[PDB]
Amino acid sequence: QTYKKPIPLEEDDYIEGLSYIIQQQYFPDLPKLKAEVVLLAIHEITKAQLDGENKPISVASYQNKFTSEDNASFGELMEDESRLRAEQHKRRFEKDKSIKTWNYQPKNALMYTPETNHKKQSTEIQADATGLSQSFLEAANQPSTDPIVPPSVNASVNGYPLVDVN
Amino acid sequence: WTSVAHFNRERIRRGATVDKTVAKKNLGRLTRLWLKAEQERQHNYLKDGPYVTADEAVAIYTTFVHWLESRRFQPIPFPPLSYKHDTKLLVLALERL
């Protein structure tokens, strides 16, 4: 389930589909909020893929299957210089027998950085955590405490009155 | 080379040496070693893509946007041609240089 290639959608289909996935998760109040101001088939495929499971799709899964046309046109463009330079690099660079010494590899681990050879998934995200509800922002705007009396008045200080003679 | 660099830096850190030459030599060796490691790290970053995934970046940007709009932050504008404090900021910068 790793080798599967993304399908090359057209751009405005890709961005429109991408924009929908973000809005359904990080800006859930956007569609309703559009109405107060005034007053394609791809996204249908994504919903129908897992109609049984109500879990909305994520940004990663959308881009793990759907990719734009330029992001897929650029890949073939860059695959040519890699495959073209392969031939360029390979041309630029009784009885008894003779000595044999080691094995030769064009890329060393001493002069060039080597390759890689070593359940791995985590970091769930709360979408509601990314914004502040209007109800909460109302609460943290209301002054409220026990007012402490000033030490002195017009003439008691610390409560005990200033004594006259009379 | 690397073993000698390790040994001499540990000796310098403890405080066993007073040579100026040894300190300079070891500073050069460590600078070279750190630069080799850093160059490899940049190469690996280009190879292995952005370590922060798309989901993390979107969440970070969204939370920062919500925080900024909660405080009604007014974005900083480009310094206009008719800016009152241009000379004062300029003179402060020149003094610090």
Partner: peptide
């Protein structure tokens, strides 16, 4: 989203101001 919410907030403030104007006319 921010620009839409700003429009909605300013329009709700306009609603408050116009209804306050209506209430001040009604008190008269």
């Amino acid at each position: 989203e921010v620009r839409y919410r700003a429009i909605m907030r300013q329009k709700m403030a306009e609603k408050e101001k116009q209804e306050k104007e209506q209430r001040l006319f009604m008190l008269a």
